[PDB]
Amino acid sequence: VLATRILHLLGQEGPKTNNPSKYIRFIYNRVVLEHEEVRAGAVSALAKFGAQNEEMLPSILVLLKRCVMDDDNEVRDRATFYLNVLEQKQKALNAGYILNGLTVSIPGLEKALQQYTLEPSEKPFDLKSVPLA
């Protein structure tokens, strides 16, 4: 739990430092040594470095290609997802799917989805109808 929390912090704050390459060695070493939860968090952190730092992107793509060989299904699926999103080289995809989380209220989202499942329409559920957090 502490290792995953530190990896998440490193993924958010590490890319904003003067020398982001310094942290990648420690994050990648978790993929080789640690349990499945910590490996999954390490892959997510590496993807955040690749999405924020264009100079690190080619190195992160090679590291994610190594992580696609992971035996754990969720670690491999995360590595596959982030590799394919980063290979598109689109800043809008990186911001949408790697850097920025949901901006909606969770209780508001739950309640809106519960109403929509009771009265399903031909229009898809619109996330913009949910109040912002």
Binding site: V1, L2, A3, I6, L7, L9, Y23, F26, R30
Partner: peptide
């Protein structure tokens, strides 16, 4: 320091 701590964190 937090990076050194996660290298041997039991929690």
């Amino acid at each position: 320091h937090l990076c050194e701590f996660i290298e041997d964190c039991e929690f």
